Design an enzyme around this catalytic site. Structure first.
Site, short mmCIF file in Angstrom:
data_model
loop_
_atom_site.label_atom_id
_atom_site.label_comp_id
_atom_site.label_asym_id
_atom_site.label_seq_id
_atom_site.Cartn_x
_atom_site.Cartn_y
_atom_site.Cartn_z
N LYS A 13 0.82 -1.24 0.00
CA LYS A 13 0.00 0.00 0.00
C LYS A 13 0.84 1.27 0.00
O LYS A 13 0.63 2.16 -0.84
CB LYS A 13 -0.95 0.07 1.21
CG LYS A 13 -2.02 -0.97 1.29
CD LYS A 13 -3.06 -0.51 2.33
CE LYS A 13 -2.52 -0.58 3.75
NZ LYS A 13 -2.65 -1.92 4.28
N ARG A 88 -10.46 0.04 7.44
CA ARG A 88 -10.10 -1.35 7.52
C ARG A 88 -11.07 -2.21 8.34
O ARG A 88 -10.76 -3.35 8.69
CB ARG A 88 -8.62 -1.54 7.84
CG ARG A 88 -8.19 -1.09 9.18
CD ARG A 88 -6.75 -0.68 9.06
NE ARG A 88 -5.83 -1.77 8.78
CZ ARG A 88 -4.59 -1.59 8.34
NH1 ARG A 88 -4.13 -0.35 8.08
NH2 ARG A 88 -3.81 -2.63 8.14
N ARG A 127 11.95 -5.15 5.51
CA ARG A 127 11.64 -3.74 5.20
C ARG A 127 12.54 -2.78 5.96
O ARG A 127 12.82 -2.99 7.15
CB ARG A 127 10.18 -3.40 5.55
CG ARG A 127 9.88 -1.92 5.37
CD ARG A 127 8.37 -1.60 5.27
NE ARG A 127 7.66 -1.94 6.50
CZ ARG A 127 6.40 -1.58 6.73
NH1 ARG A 127 5.72 -0.89 5.80
NH2 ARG A 127 5.82 -1.90 7.88
N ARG A 160 10.71 -0.58 11.30
CA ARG A 160 9.51 -0.18 12.03
C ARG A 160 9.33 -1.09 13.25
O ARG A 160 9.66 -2.29 13.21
CB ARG A 160 8.27 -0.18 11.10
CG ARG A 160 7.39 1.06 11.31
CD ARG A 160 6.27 1.18 10.29
NE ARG A 160 5.19 0.23 10.54
CZ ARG A 160 4.15 0.06 9.73
NH1 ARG A 160 4.05 0.78 8.61
NH2 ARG A 160 3.21 -0.83 10.04
N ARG A 171 -0.58 -8.96 13.39
CA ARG A 171 -1.13 -8.01 12.43
C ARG A 171 -1.82 -8.76 11.27
O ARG A 171 -2.91 -8.37 10.82
CB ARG A 171 -0.02 -7.09 11.90
CG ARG A 171 0.47 -6.06 12.90
CD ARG A 171 1.84 -5.48 12.47
NE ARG A 171 1.80 -4.87 11.15
CZ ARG A 171 2.87 -4.54 10.43
NH1 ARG A 171 4.11 -4.77 10.90
NH2 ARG A 171 2.71 -3.99 9.23
N1 LIG Z 1 5.69 -5.35 -5.39
C1 LIG Z 1 6.62 -5.56 -4.43
N2 LIG Z 1 7.50 -6.62 -4.53
C2 LIG Z 1 8.42 -6.83 -3.59
N3 LIG Z 1 8.54 -6.04 -2.51
C3 LIG Z 1 7.70 -4.97 -2.36
C4 LIG Z 1 6.72 -4.71 -3.32
N4 LIG Z 1 6.02 -3.63 -2.89
C5 LIG Z 1 6.56 -3.22 -1.73
N5 LIG Z 1 7.60 -4.03 -1.41
C6 LIG Z 1 8.42 -4.00 -0.21
O1 LIG Z 1 7.60 -4.68 0.73
C7 LIG Z 1 7.62 -4.02 2.03
C8 LIG Z 1 6.12 -3.62 2.36
O2 LIG Z 1 5.79 -2.57 1.47
P1 LIG Z 1 5.01 -1.28 2.01
O3 LIG Z 1 4.55 -0.59 0.81
O4 LIG Z 1 5.76 -0.50 3.00
O5 LIG Z 1 3.82 -2.08 2.64
P2 LIG Z 1 2.34 -1.74 3.21
O6 LIG Z 1 1.36 -2.66 2.60
O7 LIG Z 1 2.12 -0.30 3.21
O8 LIG Z 1 2.65 -2.26 4.69
P3 LIG Z 1 2.37 -1.62 6.14
O9 LIG Z 1 2.96 -2.54 7.15
O10 LIG Z 1 2.79 -0.23 6.07
O11 LIG Z 1 0.80 -1.79 6.25
P4 LIG Z 1 -0.23 -1.85 7.49
O12 LIG Z 1 -1.58 -1.69 6.97
O13 LIG Z 1 0.11 -3.10 8.22
O14 LIG Z 1 0.37 -0.65 8.32
P5 LIG Z 1 -0.26 0.82 8.69
O15 LIG Z 1 0.88 1.71 8.79
O16 LIG Z 1 -1.42 1.11 7.81
O17 LIG Z 1 -0.87 0.59 10.09
C9 LIG Z 1 0.00 0.37 11.23
C10 LIG Z 1 -0.86 0.11 12.47
O18 LIG Z 1 -1.66 1.27 12.77
C11 LIG Z 1 -2.97 0.85 13.16
N6 LIG Z 1 -4.02 1.29 12.17
C12 LIG Z 1 -3.71 1.84 10.99
N7 LIG Z 1 -4.84 2.13 10.33
C13 LIG Z 1 -5.88 1.77 11.09
C14 LIG Z 1 -7.26 1.83 10.94
N8 LIG Z 1 -7.88 2.32 9.82
N9 LIG Z 1 -8.04 1.35 11.93
C15 LIG Z 1 -7.51 0.83 13.06
N10 LIG Z 1 -6.20 0.78 13.24
C16 LIG Z 1 -5.34 1.21 12.28
C17 LIG Z 1 -2.91 -0.66 13.26
O19 LIG Z 1 -2.44 -0.94 14.60
C18 LIG Z 1 -1.87 -0.99 12.21
O20 LIG Z 1 -1.29 -2.31 12.44
C19 LIG Z 1 8.65 -2.88 1.87
O21 LIG Z 1 9.95 -3.35 2.28
C20 LIG Z 1 8.63 -2.63 0.38
O22 LIG Z 1 9.83 -2.08 -0.14
MG LIG Z 2 2.29 1.47 4.67
#
Ligand SMILES: Nc1ncnc2c1ncn2[C@@H]1O[C@H](COP(=O)(O)OP(=O)(O)OP(=O)(O)OP(=O)(O)OP(=O)(O)OC[C@H]2O[C@@H](n3cnc4c(N)ncnc43)[C@H](O)[C@@H]2O)[C@@H](O)[C@H]1O
Ligand SMILES: [Mg+2]
Ligand SMILES: [Zn+2]
Length: 217
Positions: A13, A88, A127, A160, A171
């Protein structure tokens, strides 16, 4: 250009969001980023969020909807926006529909970035993130040009706090529970588009551009 990205932890994402923002000129809204910033500042909201985030659990719907409503009320969102990692839960999606109805800014597409779950652990554990700009790299799949530092600004890379194996497992369990109902919610509203996130980064973005390049005012 009112777009939501959904996908399991690690699906890509944030990687796709950075490219959508650069190409299309709409603001990035990430609940993850907002929470972690508030944590770093150790505000009451941040101190409440931290408890959930540290365990890999979802922050409660109420506070979450609130911060997104607040962000969307800012002037820049008038031209569009890219919501990353919100909604989500179905309750968040329902509240969003109502907010955007009031604002007159309904979602164009919800883009679901699909990656086999068996890939996601390595995505996250390998990552590395820029401490200055927040862009993400991967030691195997997308390494920086110079180890430990960001291509764009020279900033120091870090891991992270929630990317440890134990937290990732949680997660993944928490968010996988949400996948079917959210997909069913948005498939109903006829805005859901699936993309194959299991491709080279530029190839996933190629497919995203097919969708977003189609939009005309
Ligand atoms: N095509 C490809 N091929 C190979 N490698 C690739 C690739 N694309 C990317 N990569 C590599 O793969 C890795 C991942 O890519 P990356 O693009 O960084 O991945 P991502 O899908 O964004 O992963 P996140 O861990 O950031 O997502 P999340 O939803 O778990 O976290 P969030 O911050 O929203 O949320 C964090 C926390 O906040 C809270 N939270 C956030 N939003 C909410 C909500 N709406 N409601 C309730 N709680 C929430 C929760 O506690 C949540 O766990 C990187 O190393 C990248 O380089
Ligand atoms: Mg992200
Ligand atoms: Zn950087």
């Amino acid at each position: 250009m009112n777009i939501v990205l959904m996908g399991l932890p690690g699906a890509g994402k944030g990687t796709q969001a950075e490219r959508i923002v650069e190409k299309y000129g709409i603001p990035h809204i990430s609940t993850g980023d907002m929470f972690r910033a508030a944590m770093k500042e150790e505000t009451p909201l941040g101190l409440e969020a931290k408890s959930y985030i540290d365990k890999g659990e979802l922050v409660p719907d109420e506070v979450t909807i609130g911060i997104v409503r607040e962000r969307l009320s800012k002037s820049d969102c008038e031209r569009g926006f890219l919501l990353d990692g919100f909604p989500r839960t179905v309750a968040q999606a329902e509240a969003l529909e109502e907010i955007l109805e009031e604002m007159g800014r309904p979602i164009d597409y919800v883009i679901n970035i699909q990656v086999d779950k068996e890939e996601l652990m390595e995505r996250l554990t390998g990552r590395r993130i820029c401490s200055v700009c927040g862009t993400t790299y991967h030691l195997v799949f997308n390494p920086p040009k110079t180890p430990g530092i960001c291509d764009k600004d020279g900033g120091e890379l870090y891991q992270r706090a929630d990317d440890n194996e134990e937290t990732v497992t949680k997660r993944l369990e928490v968010n996988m529970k949400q996948t079917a109902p959210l997909l069913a919610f948005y498939d109903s509203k006829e805005v859901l588009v699936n993309v194959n996130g299991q491709q080279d980064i530029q190839d996933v973005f190629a497919d995203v551009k097919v969708i977003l390049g189609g939009l005309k005012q």
